[PDB]
Structure formats: structure tokens, C-alpha cells
Scaffold this active site. Structure first.
Site, PDB file in Angstrom:
ATOM      1  N   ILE A   1       0.830  -1.201   0.000  1.00 11.51           N
ATOM      2  CA  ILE A   1       0.000   0.000   0.000  1.00 11.51           C
ATOM      3  C   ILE A   1       0.861   1.246   0.000  1.00 11.51           C
ATOM      4  CG2 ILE A   1      -1.806   1.275   1.208  1.00 11.51           C
ATOM      5  CD1 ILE A   1      -2.776  -1.290   2.356  1.00 11.51           C
ATOM      6  N   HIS A   2       1.544   1.493  -1.110  1.00  8.74           N
ATOM      7  CA  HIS A   2       2.406   2.668  -1.212  1.00  8.74           C
ATOM      8  C   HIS A   2       2.069   3.475  -2.460  1.00  8.74           C
ATOM      9  CE1 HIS A   2       4.715   0.789   1.947  1.00  8.74           C
ATOM     10  NE2 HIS A   2       5.113  -0.202   1.169  1.00  8.74           N
ATOM     11  N   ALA A   3       2.909   4.466  -2.745  1.00  4.82           N
ATOM     12  CA  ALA A   3       2.765   5.319  -3.914  1.00  4.82           C
ATOM     13  C   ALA A   3       1.335   5.705  -4.205  1.00  4.82           C
ATOM     14  CB  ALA A   3       3.373   4.639  -5.131  1.00  4.82           C
TER      15      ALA A   3
END
Ligand SMILES: O=P(O)(O)OC[C@H]1O[C@](O)(COP(=O)(O)O)[C@@H](O)[C@@H]1O
Ligand SMILES: O=P(O)(O)OC[C@H]1O[C@](O)(COP(=O)(O)O)[C@@H](O)[C@@H]1O
Lengths: 87, 275, 275, 87
Positions: free
Chosen positions: A13-15
Site C-alpha cells: 500500500i504505497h505510492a
């Protein structure tokens, strides 16, 4: 009020895929929170979701508590599979 | 009084790394309707200070700042600022100014230590411009501690630098195999030099991981565009970006800063450049 | 009346290509003391038009614009502009608005034709999003003309698309070898898919150029970070950048535009992905 | 007044290494011009140098005509080898 998932996104769950799930939470008006490894911070806050560091294959719980829980816990599911995060 | 436009001083956006960060910034500065005014400095201490004047002058609610080396002086001038300033993927030993980064020294250790575990004798290190505080003061140490902590000869010749260019990454592999005692595992300060290290080491007729094993940094996309696929220490650039601006948003819209000195999580992505 | 700040709308600066261009811009907009206000659009026709409003509104001497597809409508709105606008590495069939690019259709031909010369029977083509005017209307044609001009079967199945991602570049190589009549040479619409094409084709147990020969585009740096080294059609991104702003400087400071519709030189860089 | 070279720069005269040789010509006050393949345009102009497309191994002539020719034709030589263009 809550809906638990399992993330299969190589990115976790990034960017943007994360900025998306946080932008799709500032819409609703209830109270949504994410819970990873028993840690809880406002799912409607970047530094909160970006502080956790949700890798891959990590079970997570979306908790909605407000005048439109079902609506929130529903669209977020879309927002998740529409971004290819969890399942 | 404000201008709805935060300034950002980056070294060179023609770089995967810096651009990848610029995008995190954008997206969030957007999310909070703030215009950005980007400008490169090409890591020129003079141009850096100057750029900071021009930008401050043209009235900017805030400033994001990135440099390979925050000078002792930069802190003087960046203290005399009239507006919030937060550093991104750049560090300075006093913490007078906010800053979002990764726990560098730790990851540098965690990785070298991952190779000791793997059962390695001679571990080498290929870093970049030693004069940069983030390198010699953080990544190198990690490499050393990981070793001194397992009782292994801290050999000044096993650490060989180069610029952050793929080309350099190849020469180091050569100068490294030039040693009587050849390394069996190489830790590289960054993804693109790591690609040069694979190739350079392959041309000599060696296999990866079969002969020497390698481990990169940043986990950029070049990490997947090689053969074998580079194992890299994960650094979330876009996240460093995002969070760097967001914290600035707090400081600028006066919310409440839990901590102005941040350090997001990190990990290793084991692909095939290391068995 | 002016603001000394030109606006730039790019799709995504986390891309080597677009960032490489953003740097040309910067450097020159700097050289003429103009601030830039960058903003991404993620190739969203709506966000694109909207971004153009916001930027025009906040009073900007000029605007640089990049898109994979300039809509017939974009031209309506970009005509109703109050300030100079020049397109970069983006095209639109009417030439009502300035635009600095490369002679695409030509280079696409020059390259395919370089393989016919090499002595090739079945030439394939791996492009990106066919819906983009620069692709189907320029690069594809070149590939076809280069063929029809030498009397070779223009096979609709030999052209297979994909997004501009390294991953896609691999699948195409598979779907291409799936053919009864296998290609012996592949032209790829862009450097990073070309890298995926090398690998994907190598995993199957084939050699480059030994078996199939490949030729890329953009001559980005990934062109050198492979094994073998990618032969690519040269497109000077930074130059497209530089010249794109410079021409805007002329249009903005009212100098004299020799031609508002530009097209800088191009060539091929023969490395080893083609013998 | 003039000084001919031979470019051995893999990059030729593009990008920053070119923007540099044009920025190091707007300094002097004479009249400098570049001549490639017998084509001549103001070496003190970007679109002029960027229009030519000087590949590698291409002989080029720097022509200076003004109240400070020698000074121009001198520093440009530095600017060339200091950027690793020609020799
Ligand atoms: O992944 P790459 O292309 O090797 O890049 C990383 C190098 O670039 C950096 O931003 C440093 O850049 P500078 O040399 O311009 O300061 C760091 O990520 C590292 O020092
Ligand atoms: O060299 P790469 O990384 O394959 O990139 C090239 C692709 O990116 C592009 O800018 C297109 O980008 P978009 O898909 O974002 O419009 C072109 O250069 C080509 O369509």
C-alpha cells in the site's frame, strides 16, 4: 462496520495506489480507520497509511463508523480491487 | 498573504530517483491545492543557496529541499527562513529542520548482515560519492557494524566508490576482482550501479548469484529489468515524497506535528541476484 | 502584466522519458529567467483540460503541453488560449499550435528498412497504445511503408501492442513466437519494452541478435544497461525539451519565429541487439 | 578568428553539454558562429545548435568575429574539453 482483507499487491500500500485509497476515504463522511498488525491510525491520513508500511500478503482491517458506514466500507472495496491491492 | 505555491529544490529530475520523488510531492501538493515551483541545482552548493533565495523571495508558503549534502551552512540559512522547510531523502546531523527519510544505517546493516547469514566470508561495498553524509556517515557504517558485529576484517580496500552511474558500477566490480582475496558477495549503494555490477561481473565470466551475490538499494524499477533480478533494500521514494509534502502541509496550515523528524519503514526484496 | 512563470502540463514525471524532457525545459526556462509550474495529468483527457484552465487562470506567460493524444477538442480549447502554447513530443494533425517533435514516421521506416537491408523476411512490430496518434498514425505507418515499399506481406498479426512497460515488452515476444511463421527481427516502439523483448526472447532460449534482432526507440539510457546493448532510434528528449521552451521564449518575448512547427534531426545508434 | 575541432563525445552536441556551450557564448560580446557540414547558424542560439544535430566524429568550426575574438575562441576551447565534447 468493518471489512478485513488480504493484500496481494507486489507494491503493498504505497505510492499512488495508496494515495488513491486515502483520497477515496476523504470523500465519505463517516470515520474510517485501517488496522495493521494491531496498530491503528486514521485511514483518511497519508502519514498514517505511509507510516505503517503494509508489505505484501498482509491482512488488514478497514473500520468504518459513522452516518454512512456501509457506503464507505463498500466503495473502499471497489477502490481496493480497482487498484489491484488486496482481495 | 500566502501564494498557494510551495517551492521545491531538487538536484536533477532527469534521474529516476529524484523524479520518482518529485511525483510523490506533486500528487500530494495537488491533493492540498498547492502549486509547486520546481528547480534543479545539479548538486551545486552555490546554486543551491541561491535557488533558496529566489524561491523564498517570490513568496512561497513552503519549501521542500533535497541535496546529497546539507552543509553546516545550509542549516544556518535554512534556519533564517520565513517559511516551513522540510528535507526529503537528504540528511543533516542536527535535526533543526524537519526531514522525511529512511533509517539508512539500519538498512545498510540489515542487508550486509543478510549476506553474513547466507554464509559469506569477504563482503565488499560499492558506494557513491563518499563526501555525502548519507553515504559515509550512514550506509558505510552499517556495512562496517554489520561486519565488526560478527567479527570480520573491516578492509578499507573492500569499499570502493564511484558516481551513481551504471558505468561506474562495472569498474568497481573489476577493481574488486583485482584483489588477491576476491569478494563472494557485493553490497551496492544503489540500484543502477548494482546493474553495472551484475554485468561487469558477468563479462569476466562469473555467475550471479552462483559466484558473487549482489544486493542493491532503492528498489527502483531497474531492479526488475535485469537478469538475474536485483535483490534490493526498499526505499519508498514516492512515499518519502508524499509524506515530505504532507508534513509540510501540516506545518503550513498549522495542524499539529507529532514529529517533524520522520523515518518511514524499510525492507529487502529478495529476487535472484542473491541465492 | 506578465508573471515570469510559464506552465507545463506533463503526464507523469516519474517516467525517464517525460522527466528527461522536463529537464530540457527547466534548464532553458532557467536560462531565460522564467519560473515553471509543473503538473501531471496521468493522460486523463479531463484532468488535462482542467489543468489547462487552472494554469491559464493563475496568469502564466506561456504553456508547454505534452500528451499521448491531443484531442480534436484540445485544439479548440488550446486555440482559445490567451498565451503562447507549444507542444512537446506530442502531435496533432492540423498544426494550428506550435510543436517541437522528431520526424516519427521517418525514423520508424528508417529502422525497419535497416533490417530489410540486413536481410530479413518476417519483421514484427511491438508498439504501444494504438489509440495514440503518434503511434498508429506515425510509427506504425513507417513500419508498413518500409515493408510495402520492398514488397513484404503487411501482416496485421505481426503488429502487437502493449503499454509502455517493460513487462508488456516480454509478453509481446511470447505472443510473437506463438506464430507459426516466427519473426527474425523485431522493431519496438520504445526502449523499455525493448528491454523486456530481449529478456522475454532470451528466456525462451533464443539469442540476440543471433536469432531475432531487435531495435528500440528514444535511445534512453536503458539502451546501454542491457546485455546485449540495445540499438535504438535516437530521439533527443532534452533537446525536444530545450527547443520547445526556447521557441516559447521567442513567441513570448516576441522575437521572430522562423517556423513554429519544428522537427529536430534523428538517427540510429547501432549497438549489439542487431548484427 | 576561427578554430576547427573534431567531436569525440558519444553524445555529440546535445542536452546540457550543448546548453553549456551556448551559455558559454552569450558571455562574450563578439560574434560567434558554428559551421557543420557547411551550414551556419548563430552558435549563441539554442535552436541553431539543436537544429544541426552534430553526431559524433563530426568536424566543426567555431568562428568568432568581434572586439574580443581571441578571448572567445579561447574560452570556448576550454568549454569544449571541460565538457568532454571535441578535441
Ligand atoms: O538508482 P540510481 O539511478 O543509481 O540513483 C541513486 C543515486 O541518486 C541519488 O539521488 C543521488 O543523486 P545525486 O548524485 O544527484 O545527489 C541517490 O538515490 C543515489 O545517491
Ligand atoms: O522509454 P519508455 O520508458 O518505454 O517510455 C516511452 C513511452 O512513454 C511515453 O512518454 C508515453 O507516455 P504515456 O503513456 O504516459 O503517454 C513515450 O516516450 C512512449 O509512449
Amino acid at each position: 462496520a468493518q471489512k478485513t482483507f488480504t493484500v496481494t499487491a507486489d507494491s503493498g500500500i504505497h505510492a499512488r495506489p495508496a494515495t488513491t485509497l486515502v483520497q477515496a476515504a476523504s470523500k465519505f463522511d463517516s470515520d474510517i480507520n485501517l488496522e495493521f498488525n494491531g496498530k491503528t491510525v486514521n485511514l483518511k491520513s497519508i502519514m498514517g497509511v505511509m507510516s505503517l508500511g503494509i508489505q505484501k500478503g498482509a491482512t488488514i482491517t478497514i473500520s468504518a463508523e459513522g452516518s454512512d458506514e456501509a457506503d464507505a466500507l463498500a466503495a473502499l472495496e471497489d477502490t481496493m480491487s480497482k487498484e489491484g491491492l488486496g482481495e | 498573504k500566502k501564494t498557494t505555491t510551495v517551492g521545491v529544490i531538487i538536484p536533477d529530475i532527469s534521474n529516476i530517483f529524484y523524479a520518482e520523488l518529485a511525483r510523490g510531492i506533486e500528487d500530494i501538493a495537488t491533493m492540498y491545492k498547492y502549486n509547486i515551483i520546481l528547480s534543479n541545482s545539479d548538486q551545486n552548493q552555490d546554486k543551491e543557496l541561491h535557488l533558496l533565495n529566489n524561491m523564498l523571495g517570490k513568496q512561497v508558503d513552503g519549501i521542500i529541499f533535497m541535496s546529497g549534502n546539507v552543509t553546516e551552512e545550509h542549516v544556518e540559512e535554512l534556519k533564517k527562513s520565513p517559511v516551513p522547510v522540510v528535507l526529503a531523502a537528504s540528511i543533516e546531523s542536527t535535526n533543526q529542520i524537519p526531514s522525511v527519510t529512511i533509517d539508512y544505517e539500519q538498512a545498510a546493516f540489515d542487508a550486509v548482515q543478510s549476506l553474513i547469514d547466507s554464509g559469506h566470508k569477504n563482503i565488499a561495498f560499492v558506494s557513491g560519492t563518499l563526501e555525502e553524509p548519507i553515504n559515509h556517515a550512514k550506509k558505510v557504517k552499517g556495512y562496517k557494524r554489520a561486519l565488526t558485529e560478527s567479527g570480520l576484517p573491516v578492509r578499507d580496500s573492500y569499499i570502493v566508490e564511484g558516481d551513481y552511474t551504471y558505468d561506474s558500477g562495472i569498474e568497481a566490480v573489476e577493481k574488486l576482482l583485482e584483489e588477491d582475496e576476491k569478494p563472494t558477495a557485493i553490497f551496492v549503494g544503489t540500484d543502477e550501479m548494482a546493474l553495472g555490477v551484475i554485468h561487469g561481473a558477468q563479462d569476466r565470466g562469473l555467475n550471479v548469484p552462483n559466484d558473487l551475490e549482489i544486493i542493491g538499494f532503492d528498489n527502483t524499477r531497474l531492479s526488475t529489468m535485469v537478469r538475474p533480478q536485483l535483490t534490493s533494500v526498499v526505499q519508498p521514494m514516492y512515499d518519502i515524497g508524499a509524506v515530505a509534502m504532507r508534513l509540510l502541509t501540516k506545518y503550513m496550515n498549522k495542524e499539529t506535528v507529532d514529529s517533524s523528524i520522520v523515518q518511514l519503514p524499510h525492507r529487502i526484496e529478495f529476487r535472484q541476484s542473491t541465492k
